[PDB]
Ligand binder design. Structure first.
Ligand code: MET
Length: 517
């Protein structure tokens, strides 16, 4: 099925300002989207804001503004932050959007017509901050903001309260077997693998039914009303998860405003998501509830959910650090430092070590070497003479790299993709050191042509595969190398030899990444 590659971030609660968590999740979404564009595919990358619910209305109340003004202001802050971070997200969705509300109503009605929503009761614990129902085994003793004794969540440490309400209930318990079939038939559907095992164990234990409405007073009336029952409001998570469906059905103009909601998702060829990017805190909502809703509605299930090691929901301001160290460099660092865990060093010390060691010394040094007037005297891509075995060993690494990096990007595992590209960059550097092309200008011009050609081509291929990570710097490198625009994307240009000998380098001025103390 040739379709639009559909990648999403979570939609973030607007109770507080954009921080590194949100920026990280959206960065991952962006990188995946960029890689598929570089590959030549149609892409739709989605991000946005989750604006309804008790938690947002209470944050608005604290600031003494109306929820409408509060959500609009904070959404504006998220939008500004993502523009400054230089993402290439196709659409920014807000759950206050009238087209989103219509989709929530259609989905609700569909679930109700199937017999999967009934009127019942929830009596149990609830975390307002997580918008999450909890069994007594997921709570323990703790303290509130003040310090008085209370119950808290085992998941997040936030305060829990006992709720007793008549609620519309989704028959989640009826979907246990089908969810387990789905996990087993699609063993790459949740990444990384240990998070997939966690989900399976949880569903094997048994699933209760899920409350999907609340009484309107509890939510301070700041929510989507239930169709045909205005005393109730739709659970912020059914509302929130539905953004992915809404997003898949919006025609978007050249400036990013939604202009139209289509009736059938197949018309735009996005649904279901190829990758849902999430933090580990919302795994259950995405890997249990969401597919159960989709199964109930007869809608297709997402292909992959990737859950990263950070939380989604001592200051670290990403825009400040990016102004200090560079935007591409910060993005590189966030993606290189952590895989699917928290155990990872985010200090100025480590940022500088990676900036200096990998970006400046490995990549940047190598870009300057192969384009300098001292070594590349004609300022062009030379024609290679015959290859030695050592030449062939490096060429083989360069040729294998696109296949290797591609598999990593598709897992997705961006850290391993970066590591694989840099392994090849290190090998190119070792080769340049062995061949001493600076000596070869005088001693053996015929040999230098071969060495310089291989070096230029290794730099091109590595840079192409790093272009989703370093989108601006990749453009600078390609300009220095004189790579025509047509050769800067497309799977055809993953092949060794795509830029012919005779191609002129770009003009010189001059640093790519400047080292720090
Ligand atoms: C459908 S994704 C919703 C994510 C949620 N608003 C959060 O901040 O965790």
């Amino acid at each position: 099925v040739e379709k639009v590659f559909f990648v999403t971030s979570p939609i973030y609660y607007v109770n507080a300002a954009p921080h590194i968590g949100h920026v990280y999740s959206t960065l991952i979404t962006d990188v995946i989207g960029r890689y598929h564009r570089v590959k030549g595919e149609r892409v739709f990358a989605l991000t946005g804001t989750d604006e309804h619910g008790q938690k947002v209305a209470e944050a608005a109340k604290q600031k003494q503004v109306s929820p409408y003004d509060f959500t609009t202001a904070v959404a504006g802050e998220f939008k500004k932050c993502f523009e400054q971070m230089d993402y290439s997200i196709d659409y920014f969705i807000r759950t206050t959007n009238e087209q989103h509300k219509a989709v929530v109503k259609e989905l609700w009605t569909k679930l109700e017509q199937k017999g999967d929503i009934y009127l019942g009761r929830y009596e149990g614990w609830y975390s307002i901050s997580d918008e999450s129902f909890l069994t007594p085994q997921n709570i323990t003793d703790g303290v509130d903001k003040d310090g008085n004794p209370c119950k808290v969540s085992l998941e997040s440490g936030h305060v829990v309260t006992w709720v007793s309400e008549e609620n519309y209930m989704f028959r989640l318990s009826a979907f246990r077997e089908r969810l387990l079939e789905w996990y087993h038939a699609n063993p790459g559907c949740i990444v990384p693998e240990f998070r997939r095992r966690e989900v399976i164990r949880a569903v094997e234990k048994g699933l209760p039914d899920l409350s999907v409405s609340r009484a309107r007073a509890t939510l301070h009336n700041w929510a989507i009303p239930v169709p045909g029952n205005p005393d109730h409001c739709v659970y912020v998570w059914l509302d929130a998860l539905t953004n992915y469906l809404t997003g898949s059905r919006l025609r978007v103009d050249e400036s990013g405003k939604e202009v139209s909601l289509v009736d059938d998702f197949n018309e735009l060829e996005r649904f279901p998501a190829d990758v849902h990017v999430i933090g580990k805190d919302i795994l259950k909502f995405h890997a249990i509830y969401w597919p159960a809703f989709l199964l109930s509605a007869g809608l297709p299930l997402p292909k992959k959910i990737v859950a990263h090691g950070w939380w989604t929901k001592n200051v670290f301001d990403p825009v400040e650090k990016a102004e200090e160290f560079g935007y591409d460099a910060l993005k590189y660092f966030l993606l290189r430092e952590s895989g699917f865990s928290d155990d990872g060093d985010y200090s100025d010390k480590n940022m500088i070590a990676r900036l200096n060691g990998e970006l400046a010394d490995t990549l940047g040094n190598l870009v300057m070497r192969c384009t300098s007037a001292k070594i590349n005297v004609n300022g062009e891509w030379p024609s290679p003479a015959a290859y030695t075995e050592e030449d062939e060993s490096l060429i083989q690494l360069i040729k294998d790299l696109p296949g290797t990096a591609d598999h990593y990007y598709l897992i997705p595992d961006i850290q391993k993709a970066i590591i694989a590209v840099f392994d090849v960059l290190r090998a190119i550097n070792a080769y340049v050191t062995d061949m001493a092309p600076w000596k070869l200008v005088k001693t053996d011009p015929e040999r230098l042509r071969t060495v310089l050609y291989i070096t230029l081509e290794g730099v091109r291929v590595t840079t192409l595969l790093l272009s989703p990570i370093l989108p601006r710097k990749s453009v600078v490198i390609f300009d220095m190398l004189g790579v025509p625009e047509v050769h800067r994307k497309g799977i055809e240009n993953f092949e060794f030899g795509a830029v012919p000998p005779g191609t002129r380098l770009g003009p010189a001025v001059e640093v790519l990444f400047s080292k720090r103390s």
